[PDB]
Design a protein around this nucleic acid. Structure first.
Lengths: 98, 41, 157, 48, 138, 59, 180, 128, 154
RNA sequence: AGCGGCGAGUACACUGUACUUGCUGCUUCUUAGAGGAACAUUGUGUGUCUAACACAAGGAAGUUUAAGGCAACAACAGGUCUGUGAUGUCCUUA
RNA sequence: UGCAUACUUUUCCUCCGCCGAAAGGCGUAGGUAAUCUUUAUCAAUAUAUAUCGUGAUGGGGAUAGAUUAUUGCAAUUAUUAAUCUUGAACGAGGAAUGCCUAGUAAGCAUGAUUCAUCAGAUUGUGCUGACUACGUCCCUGCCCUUUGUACACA
């Protein structure tokens, strides 16, 4: 079960939900995985005309990705996440045994 | 201009000025006497 | 089968459509929300895909477009902002204004922070434009939401 | 007609209706002239 | 038994594993003399003398090289080995000489034990140089 | 030619057309010699002069 | 307890002017096996002098044309130069450099009237003139840069005319004396 | 020993052979490096001992090298498109071939030939 | 000057414990004496790399590359055809255009790799697709490394 | 992704090593979630003894630790209707 | 060969084994991506030894000619390009000007953009870590105060 987004707190609270559910259900849940945050940078210049001191500004996209794993039924977790996720957060479910 | 040849301290710069020879033939003469820039033994 | 990197920019394109579509459709009232009238909206959206600063700014744009005097319309809308709760409001209108010389009038009242990233986070913006007989009018309404507490706001009880 | 899938005329801007100054970075295909103001509505902020 | 420490100055990195042995102080695969430049080899030799060859004879250091230029890598290696010897003296071998070793290391310089924050800044605007500008015409 | 010792204790001030000259006091004999210097001069430095009885202008 | 290039401990230092010694800051604190020490040099004022003189030479001799950044090449050239000096002059190369620095530095100058020169400025311009004499010696003169550096430094240590630093501090002294 | 006169200026007596044979022809040094390689002359020795037999070997290798192991790609004037084939033809006859192609160019009167007659390059030096 | 004092304890078990240049030249002489491979004559009229644009001018460059290819093969468990090209990438000044790095010719390195494959010093398997050196080559190079180490030691 | 441990070793050391293949005690080290540290801190000093700044020491951090982005009040008759189905007016439309 | 019709996805970087000096091609691993390119590693000035050893030389690479392949239904105004030949000035640049306060001057490279192909453009990053002040109004550009105006489109 890995979740990806752009903003910070929306995935922190969802991972807190993951941890509290793991503690409640006493599952064989592995520890949190802290993937590096990737940044994507594009360029664009102001001054729509050709004159003036050409100026260049940089915007950033801060992609996010965090992984966890659990040993339980997929239906209960795929209901529990949809209970307490936000529309701006996406998840993918992969199961483990030991 | 140059007028050095091969026909007639051990440092190449000193002996080249001593014998009025090019640096390459100076290195050759040094090797001949003993038997890029390096320190002494 | 698309990447997340291209998926999020496809989503950005979708929200680029959604912002302008919401701006066009939300004209008779405020911002009632979005869905993840209604029947037609959902049908069109599916077919193609497969305290309110914006509302107040649109109200003032309507009052200017109907031919009502800018001075009185702006004064009224500023009073409604003040009674809505924003500590102030920065409204500026530009265009021809009855003459051939470009001009603008700025109404100043209160704190009116105008720069800095905390200012941008706290303060929301609205800027609209519309046609006129011999030009185009531009209206800017800056509404600042009530302040977490501002770092400059200091008091000890 | 002679439409070709390559070159400058293969694609045009998706909004501004002018193909000049199209950015194809990250497969956006939106002209920069409109993209300057479309950056915020897409949600692509400027910080530094 | 064993200790694992780190050292980073500039972009170069270094991880040092210090363990008991017969003196197999090996930088990954290659030895510490075969790097080629003896100028950096002298600096590598510098921390060895201040501690003791007889002391180092009883311990093996596993040193890993990954990234950075020659000077940056040698500085990272020096930080890694300094932290390794300090931590090993604090942990396993002897505490009495640890204070003297760290005092003399501090006295000689500050760069031997902990590195520097000196790094490359993000590029500003005006010119190709990090603080240059285009030759404006007139 | 010759060089003779001098001592600087306190910085009186800086002058000059660009700010690069600092007024200082030397110590050979008297025990006070007005002089002007350029560059970094700190408290407690040892310097040298040209002649023992030539005086500058205080500004 | 430190030998320079594992050769010279330089335990003996001349009395000199008892100020250039402080400026060069030669001691076991600044004792170095090899050049190119990356300690902080632009922290405060005094760190300009806290740098070793051997480090200053290799930092300042490397400025001509495309030679910018060739600090390892500078280290090689100076290391060979010390070997050349130990051979063709019986005295210690460190003592040669020390004597050349103490006697080759200008003492007074002119910016307007004639003024004095800071002590850190004295050691700075001494290094500068030694390096720039090496530059003009190596500027298209058949003979090699290492020999140029060795000849210039020994000539400035022996106070002869063939050293550019020696013949240029004299010009500075005479021009400043003429001004005041 | 030094200063040996051949068809071209070959005063190269103190320098090395791999520059001596390039100075006279193939001053790009790669054609005359391969010529030296074919002739099998030691490069260690200098130009003060150029025997006549080595120059004879140079000319022998130069005379129609197509019968040797050298492929046509390395040889200049690979085709010079016509009914027949050719080879590198050394110095004066090399410039003779160049001017023969130049006069063929002129009588073919291409646009680039017109610019060449006017005194202009092909790509354009862009004085604009 | 080649040999330098070492304060730590050596092991002397492979070429990793010996300097690269001395070993590659010693093994170039070893292969020149043993006549294990050809020159080859076909590589003679082609320069080392496109960016080189000039003859290496040493008469043994092919043998030096032959001694270095397996040297890098021991260092890296898996390599590629472009690995040698990148390792021996050189400056290329396209006339007026500025310098850029460029890879050397791949046919010559492919051919010498085939030569050592015929010699048996290198083997290929579906698993670990990158080139690796066989077990017999391991002990051969180990013995040669210890064989040069003993003379260069004392 | 890193540090180890052992199942079998390739050769040497000696009473482990350069390199593989399979599993997992653990995560300063490959990475990062929040937070803290730094505030002329202290001491020797100047100052209308208030507001200030200097050296040294602890400290990675003593010019805000440093590059950045937000850029008002007001204007240019600066550029852009050749960027927009944003754009008025004069002009073209078989 | 040309049009019409159906099947995989050929429509990105590519590692491999070969063909071809190379360009480029062939059937393919991997990957919608810390997995595959590729990053226990992508460059260079350096490091060491060697041909040369300051003579516009073999430095220098402007120039055109002979061609092998790709990009593009179109490279002719020879795009891109592997090979050779061809061999201009250039002895460090006058009156003058621009940038420079510490991973910063300066030098060395590398990724991204527009791209069917093509950076010598702009931008992101890394390496080589320097010469120096640590202040001033004398130049210049701005600011305040005082003053004089017959200027106010100043």
């Amino acid at each position: 079960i890995a979740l990806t987004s752009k903003n910070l707190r929306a995935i922190e609270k969802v991972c807190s939900d993951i941890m509290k559910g793991a503690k409640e259900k006493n599952l064989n849940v592995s520890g949190p995985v802290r993937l590096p945050v990737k940044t994507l940078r594009i360029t664009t210049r102001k001054s729509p005309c050709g004159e003036g001191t050409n100026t260049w500004d940089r915007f950033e996209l801060r992609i996010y990705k965090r992984l966890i794993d659990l040993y339980s039924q997929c239906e209960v977790v795929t209901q529990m996440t949809s209970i307490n996720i936000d529309p701006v957060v996406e998840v993918e479910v992969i199961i483990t045994d030991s | 201009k140059l007028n050095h040849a091969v026909f007639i301290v051990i440092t190449p710069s000193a002996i080249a000025e001593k014998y009025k020879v090019n640096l390459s033939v100076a290195r050759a003469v040094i090797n001949h006497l003993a038997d890029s820039q390096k320190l002494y033994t | 089968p698309i990447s997340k990197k291209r998926k999020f920019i496809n989503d950005g394109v979708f929200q680029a459509e959604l912002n302008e579509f919401l701006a066009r459709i939300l004209a008779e009232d405020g911002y009632s929300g979005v869905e993840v009238r209604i029947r037609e909206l959902t049908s069109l959206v599916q077919k193609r895909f497969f305290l309110c600063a914006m509302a107040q700014a649109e109200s003032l744009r309507y009052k200017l477009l109907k031919g009502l005097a800018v001075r009185r319309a702006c004064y009224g809308v500023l009073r409604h902002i003040m009674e809505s709760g924003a500590k102030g409001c920065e409204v500026i209108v530009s265009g021809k204004l009855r003459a051939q010389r470009a001009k603008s009038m700025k109404f100043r009242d209160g704190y009116l922070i105008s720069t800095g990233e905390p200012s941008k986070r706290f303060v929301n913006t609205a800027t609209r434009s519309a046609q006129l007989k011999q030009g185009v009018l531009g209206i800017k309404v800056k509404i600042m939401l009530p302040t977490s507490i501002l770092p400059d706001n200091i008091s000890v009880l | 007609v002679h439409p070709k899938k390559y070159g400058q005329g293969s694609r045009q801007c998706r909004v501004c209706s002018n193909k000049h100054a199209i950015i194809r970075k990250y497969n956006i295909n939106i002209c920069r002239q409109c993209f300057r103001e479309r950056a915020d509505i897409i949600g692509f902020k400027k910080y530094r | 038994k064993r200790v694992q420490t780190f050292g980073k100055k500039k972009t170069a990195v270094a991880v040092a594993t210090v363990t008991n042995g017969k003196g197999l102080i090996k930088l990954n695969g290659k030895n510490l003399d075969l790097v080629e430049p003896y100028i950096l080899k002298t600096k590598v030799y510098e921390p060895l003398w201040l501690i003791g060859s007889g002391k180092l004879k009883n311990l093996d250091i596993r040193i890993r090289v990954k990234g950075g230029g020659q000077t940056s890598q040698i500085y990272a290696i020096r930080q890694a080995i300094g932290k390794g010897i300090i931590s090993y003296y604090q942990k396993y071998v002897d505490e009495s000489t640890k204070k003297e070793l760290k005092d003399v290391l501090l006295r000689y310089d500050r760069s031997l034990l902990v590195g520097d924050t000196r790094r490359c800044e993000p590029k500003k605007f005006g010119g190709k140089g990090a603080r240059a500008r285009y030759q404006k015409s007139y | 030619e010759k060089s003779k010792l001098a001592k600087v204790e306190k910085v009186l001030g800086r002058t000059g057309s660009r700010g690069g000259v600092i007024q200082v006091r030397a110590q050979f004999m008297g025990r006070f010699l007005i002089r002007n210097v350029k560059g970094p001069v700190r408290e407690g430095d040892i310097l040298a002069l040209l002649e023992t009885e030539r005086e500058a202008r205080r500004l | 307890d430190i030998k320079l290039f594992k050769k010279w401990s330089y335990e003996e230092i001349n009395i000199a002017d008892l100020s250039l010694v402080d400026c060069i800051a030669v001691s076991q604190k600044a004792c170095v096996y090899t050049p190119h020490t990356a300690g902080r040099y632009q922290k405060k004022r005094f760190r300009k002098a806290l740098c070793p003189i051997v480090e200053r030479l290799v930092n300042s001799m490397m400025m001509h044309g495309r030679n910018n950044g060739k600090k390892l090449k500078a280290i090689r050239i100076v290391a060979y130069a010390f070997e050349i000096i130990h051979l063709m002059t019986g005295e210690n190369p460190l003592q040669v450099f020390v004597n050349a620095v103490q006697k080759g530095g200008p003492r007074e100058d002119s910016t307007r009237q004639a003024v004095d020169v800071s002590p850190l400025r004295r050691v700075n311009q001494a290094i500068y003139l030694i390096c720039t004499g090496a530059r003009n010696a190596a500027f298209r003169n058949i003979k090699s840069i290492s020999e140029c550096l060795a000849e210039e430094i020994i000539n400035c240590a022996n106070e002869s005319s063939s050293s550019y630093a020696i013949k240029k501090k004299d010009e500075i002294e005479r021009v400043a004396k003429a001004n005041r | 020993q030094h200063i040996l006169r051949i068809l071209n200026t070959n005063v190269d007596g103190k320098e090395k052979v791999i520059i001596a044979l390039t100075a006279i022809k193939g001053i790009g040094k790669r054609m005359a490096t391969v010529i030296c390689k074919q002739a099998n002359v030691d490069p260690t020795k200098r130009a003060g001992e150029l025997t006549t037999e080595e120059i004879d070997n140079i000319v022998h290798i130069m005379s129609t090298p197509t019968q040797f192991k050298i492929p046509d790609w390395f040889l200049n004037r690979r085709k010079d498109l016509k009914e027949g084939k050719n080879i590198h033809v050394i110095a004066n006859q090399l410039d003779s071939y160049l001017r023969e192609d130049l006069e063929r160019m002129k009588k073919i009167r291409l646009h680039r030939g017109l610019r060449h007659h006017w005194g202009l390059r092909v790509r354009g030096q862009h004085t604009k | 000057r080649l040999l330098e004092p070492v304060p730590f304890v050596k092991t002397n078990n492979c070429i990793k414990d010996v300097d690269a240049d001395l070993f590659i030249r010693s093994y170039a002489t070893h292969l020149k004496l043993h006549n294990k491979i050809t020159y080859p004559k076909w590589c003679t009229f082609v320069k080392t790399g496109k960016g080189r644009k000039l003859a290496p001018l040493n008469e043994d460059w092919y043998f030096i590359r032959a001694s270095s290819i397996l040297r890098r093969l021991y260092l890296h468990p898996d390599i590629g055809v472009g690995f040698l090209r990148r390792q021996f990438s050189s400056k290329q000044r396209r006339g007026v255009a500025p310098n850029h790095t460029s890879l050397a010719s791949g046919k010559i390195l492919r051919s010498i790799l085939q030569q050592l494959e015929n010699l048996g010093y290198v083997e290929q398997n579906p698993k670990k697709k990158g080139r690796r050196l066989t077990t017999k080559g391991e002990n051969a190079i180990n013995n040669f490394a210890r064989y040069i180490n003993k003379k260069v030691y004392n």
